[PDB]
DNA sequence: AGATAAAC
DNA sequence: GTTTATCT
């Protein structure tokens, strides 16, 4: 189901959190957060074939 | 979903 | 300084 939904904002198929624009464009949760950082645009070239991880935050 | 805090 | 992924 979730499958196709491509982001409208960087073409990513995975990503962590799939936010929904009113407008109607799926955008991966990265491309709309970074987009208020700068309140502009969001540079993809950080975006991979698959969702990128770290350490995630310790479960205290 | 949204927020946080961590990590680069 | 900045950004994103994981957590709740």
């Known amino acids: ?3 196709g939904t491509v982001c409208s904002n960087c073409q990513t198929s995975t990503t962590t959190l799939w936010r929904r624009s009113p407008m109607g464009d799926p955008v991966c949760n990265a491309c709309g957060l970074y987009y208020k950082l700068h309140q502009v ?3 993809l070239t950080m975006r991979k074939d ?3 991880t770290r350490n995630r935050k310790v479960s205290s």
Do not use: V
């Open 41 to 43: 645009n969001r540079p």
């Open 50 to 52: 698959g969702i990128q």
């Open 1 to 3: 189901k979730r499958a």
